[PDB]
């Protein structure tokens, strides 16, 4: 009759926003999930981000961090958050990087 709400569709109820970074800073991607259980892997464009003392992915319950450290022009872009889990609906989430200009007199 109707499926039941542990098996429904799983979506970032805080859908992660464009964030404007210095070259000097760091970025951070906050998102938040309807399940605790799901898995979630960072992407930016084709390529997936992993760590490499230059991502920091920080999980916490339903709340998943990722901090990029270091951002270039050049890294600006689209940054993605896909929560997975056995079939039931996956999500994908977007956002987009750009770098602030140094200030100056």
């Given at each position: 009759g109707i499926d039941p709400f542990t098996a429904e569709p799983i979506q970032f109820t805080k859908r992660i926003q464009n964030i404007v970074v210095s070259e000097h800073q760091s970025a951070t991607f906050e998102?938040?999930?309807?399940?605790?259980?799901?898995?979630?892997?960072?992407?930016?464009?084709?390529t997936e981000l992993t760590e490499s003392q230059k991502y920091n992915f920080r999980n916490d319950g339903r709340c998943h961090y990722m901090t990029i450290h270091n951002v270039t022009p050049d890294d600006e872009g689209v940054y993605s958050v896909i929560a997975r889990l056995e079939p039931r609906g996956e999500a994908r989430s977007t956002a987009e990087l750009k770098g602030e200009l140094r200030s100056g007199c």
């Open positions: 998102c938040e999930v309807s399940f605790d259980d799901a898995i979630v892997t960072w992407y930016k464009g084709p």
